[PDB]
Amino acid sequence: DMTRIILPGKTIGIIGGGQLGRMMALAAKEMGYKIAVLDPTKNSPCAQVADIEIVASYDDLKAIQHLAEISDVVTYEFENIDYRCLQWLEKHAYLPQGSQLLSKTQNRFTEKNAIEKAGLPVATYRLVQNQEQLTEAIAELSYPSVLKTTTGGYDGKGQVVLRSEADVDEARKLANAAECILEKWVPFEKEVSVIVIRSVSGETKVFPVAENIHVNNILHESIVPARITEELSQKAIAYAKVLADELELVGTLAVEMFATADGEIYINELAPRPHNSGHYTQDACETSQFGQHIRAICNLPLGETNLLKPVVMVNILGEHIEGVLRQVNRLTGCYLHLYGKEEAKAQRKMGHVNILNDNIEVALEKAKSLHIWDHQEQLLE
Amino acid sequence: TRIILPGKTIGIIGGGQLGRMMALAAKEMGYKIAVLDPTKNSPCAQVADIEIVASYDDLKAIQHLAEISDVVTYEFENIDYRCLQWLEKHAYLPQGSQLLSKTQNRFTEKNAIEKAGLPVATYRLVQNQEQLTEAIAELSYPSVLKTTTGGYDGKGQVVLRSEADVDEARKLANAAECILEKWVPFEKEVSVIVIRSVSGETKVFPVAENIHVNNILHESIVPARITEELSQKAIAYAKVLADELELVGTLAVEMFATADGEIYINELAPRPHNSGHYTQDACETSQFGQHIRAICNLPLGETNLLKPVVMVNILGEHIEGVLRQVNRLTGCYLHLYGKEEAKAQRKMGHVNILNDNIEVALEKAKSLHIWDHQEQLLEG
Ligand SMILES: Nc1ncnc2c1ncn2[C@@H]1O[C@H](COP(=O)(O)OP(=O)(O)OP(=O)(O)O)[C@@H](O)[C@H]1O
Numbered sequence A: 001d002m003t004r005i006i007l008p009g010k011t012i013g014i015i016g017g018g019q020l021g022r023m024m025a026l027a028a029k030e031m032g033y034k035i036a037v038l039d040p041t042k043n044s045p046c047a048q049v050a051d052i053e054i055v056a057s058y059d060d061l062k063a064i065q066h067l068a069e070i071s072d073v074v075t076y077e078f079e080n081i082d083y084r085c086l087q088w089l090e091k092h093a094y095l096p097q098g099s100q101l102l103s104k105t106q107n108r109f110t111e112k113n114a115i116e117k118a119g120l121p122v123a124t125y126r127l128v129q130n131q132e133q134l135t136e137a138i139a140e141l142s143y144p145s146v147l148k149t150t151t152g153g154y155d156g157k158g159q160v161v162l163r164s165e166a167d168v169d170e171a172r173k174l175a176n177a178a179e180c181i182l183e184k185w186v187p188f189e190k191e192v193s194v195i196v197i198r199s200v201s202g203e204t205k206v207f208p209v210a211e212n213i214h215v216n217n218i219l220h221e222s223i224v225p226a227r228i229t230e231e232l233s234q235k236a237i238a239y240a241k242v243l244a245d246e247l248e249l250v251g252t253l254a255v256e257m258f259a260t261a262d263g264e265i266y267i268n269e270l271a272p273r274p275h276n277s278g279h280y281t282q283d284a285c286e287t288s289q290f291g292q293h294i295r296a297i298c299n300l301p302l303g304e305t306n307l308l309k310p311v312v313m314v315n316i317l318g319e320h321i322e323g324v325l326r327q328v329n330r331l332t333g334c335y336l337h338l339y340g341k342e343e344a345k346a347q348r349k350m351g352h353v354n355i356l357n358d359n360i361e362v363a364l365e366k367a368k369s370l371h372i373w374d375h376q377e378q379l380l381e
Numbered sequence B: 001t002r003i004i005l006p007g008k009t010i011g012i013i014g015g016g017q018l019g020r021m022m023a024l025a026a027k028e029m030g031y032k033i034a035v036l037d038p039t040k041n042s043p044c045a046q047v048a049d050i051e052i053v054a055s056y057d058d059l060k061a062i063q064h065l066a067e068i069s070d071v072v073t074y075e076f077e078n079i080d081y082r083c084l085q086w087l088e089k090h091a092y093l094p095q096g097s098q099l100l101s102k103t104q105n106r107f108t109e110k111n112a113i114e115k116a117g118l119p120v121a122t123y124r125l126v127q128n129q130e131q132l133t134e135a136i137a138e139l140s141y142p143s144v145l146k147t148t149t150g151g152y153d154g155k156g157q158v159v160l161r162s163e164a165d166v167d168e169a170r171k172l173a174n175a176a177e178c179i180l181e182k183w184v185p186f187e188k189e190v191s192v193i194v195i196r197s198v199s200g201e202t203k204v205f206p207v208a209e210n211i212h213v214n215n216i217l218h219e220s221i222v223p224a225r226i227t228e229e230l231s232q233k234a235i236a237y238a239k240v241l242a243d244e245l246e247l248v249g250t251l252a253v254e255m256f257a258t259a260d261g262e263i264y265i266n267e268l269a270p271r272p273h274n275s276g277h278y279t280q281d282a283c284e285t286s287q288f289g290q291h292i293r294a295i296c297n298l299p300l301g302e303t304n305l306l307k308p309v310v311m312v313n314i315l316g317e318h319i320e321g322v323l324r325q326v327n328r329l330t331g332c333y334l335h336l337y338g339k340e341e342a343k344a345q346r347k348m349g350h351v352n353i354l355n356d357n358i359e360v361a362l363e364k365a366k367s368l369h370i371w372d373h374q375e376q377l378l379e380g
């Protein structure tokens, strides 16, 4: 039903109480929605901003029941929720996002198929389930190549880059531990992402293309506008609309891409949720990805996605938090977001800072001059 | 000097929509929130970590808020002297009590404005009938008699157009201490929100043009449709006030702008203000984000207007229309405060209409037909 509207005043239920849910919840609260959250850990980032907290396991098909009960619409922010858990909600509650898109994007192999069905380029890949299949995959794809677990991967965990035969021993260890795909290395010039939003009624908006810098396989910086040709942007944007189409998107889709020196774009992966590379939108766009996500599922008119000022988002990990607090008096032109996580771990995402400036290169220099991310800048040398 | 770091608790006296919007901005930066409000489940309580339900004059509850808070601020302005002194001395209330004291009495306020070197309409204290008589004689017609305290949304005011109005005026002067002000023939009402941090850093937001109907704000238009010179004058005036009054926190400066290019300061609000809600969607930092930074002594954000805007207030009488017209809200950024009970003239929310062209934004508000009542009252 493409006409159903969840009006301000109603309750939005969110599965997963991480920072993405917290930010959804804050954007929803501005519009006067109530918020219920289910998370296995008490006092999660999202519970700190929610009206109702359900502390329970993600597979607990009774707590989930209770979430459905108290909510007028349900969404997820946790991308590794059991797809069969969602299936109950779309059957017996209101989950306009569906379970289909999630199941496709959760598995790298099935994800590759969806992208190829849509007609867009991917790195050439093979499924790997044992050593014989790894051996054949390497023989067919050669070097350089990258082995990735088909499920559960994040921050490059469950990945091995095969530069030469010397890396095969490490690849074999991983291939034994989990189902994987081997895919060709893409010698891209830049990584970019595009966040596309589509409402229950089919209205579609796309955010500006962000140029992403990863360090140790964790997002470090998002740069908007991406320093790429107008031609690449229109292509990146067209690619995202196509994906929203073929996947019948309702809600948010983050599309990560590789841009090669000849202006070709390879789709790296999809996330059916607000994405770290869209955090810049909170301070630099007319609508944030979180505001958009809420409007999409509630079937409100979408907001505009104009870039109102250039921006560099910098991630704040556990290893940075001390530096941030010490350097707080130097954060002029910097828009701090901290997620309320009670325990820092070195590489855990604790917050982000959006650095706004008319000139993108001055924003970049600001990040450097703060010295908070010396570890990242040293690794990028 | 002192800095209140993310992770600490900000305590707010007053749980209405201004407290709620302060709490939402604070949460983005990782602050905890405690609130005191006389009614359970207030707009701010819905976003707060800790809720204390009590009267604003209950010193024990005020003390309990303070003792669990690393910094205390307020949306409710009428805190009495004994509570204010306690807070200033035993809690951390960087805004202090001096500015608040000056802004709570219209005569004290106009005095402080003039002492700061700024223009206001000619005015006289009115404490009895004989002073009203002399004041009417001095200022002539037209003039406006207002109560010095308690006054908000217009009530406790008599416009004196002729001798025929003296009667209702004597009646008001009978009930309350008043001021008589000379009528300012103004073209526009405008306001400027100015921010000054604990350490003295200042930022000033763009001039807004304010349209009141029944003395409740209806619309704020930004940029105000005034000359570059009036605009520049208004901004300079607000800066002088912030400096002279040693502002810490937020100060809304409401002004009258004449066709002749004059500015008179009308009144001050030492808090985020309804005429600054446009900043949530149209500026680089909202008045709420700025307020938090100011009192916590963080570097202030920029106040650049990033897109022209018309803010329209949503009263109890409007909420039905807003919900019915939801699918027509393209380019309109809705804010609703979570108030449990509606009332006809109660502020339930606001909508920020963004557009490269101010007149298109204004036309959008009209075309929605939600505010027909306001538009007709403006017509006549
Ligand atoms: N085929 C490839 N060629 C070149 N670089 C690659 C390739 N695959 C991955 N990378 C690099 O490794 C980074 C992480 O890869 P990927 O996004 O597949 O891992 P992830 O664990 O899924 O990350 P996330 O935290 O976004 O979920 C990429 O952003 C890219 O820089």
Ligand SMILES: Nc1ncnc2c1ncn2[C@@H]1O[C@H](COP(=O)(O)OP(=O)(O)O)[C@@H](O)[C@H]1O
Pocket: B121, B144, B146, B151, B152, B153, B154, B155, B181, B182, B183, B184, B185, B189, B212, B215, B266, B267
């Ligand atoms: N001196 C004056 N000259 C002309 N108009 C005035 C004057 N004082 C008040 N008004 C009109 O009355 C309205 C309300 O006065 P104000 O002092 O703002 O009361 P309140 O504190 O209730 O808002 C103003 O918006 C303006 O239209």
Ligand SMILES: [Mg+2]
Pocket: A105, A106, A107, A111, A269, A270, A271
């Ligand atoms: Mg995926």
Ligand SMILES: [Mg+2]
Pocket: A256, A269
């Ligand atoms: Mg990735």
Ligand SMILES: [Mg+2]
Pocket: B254, B267
């Ligand atoms: Mg007024």
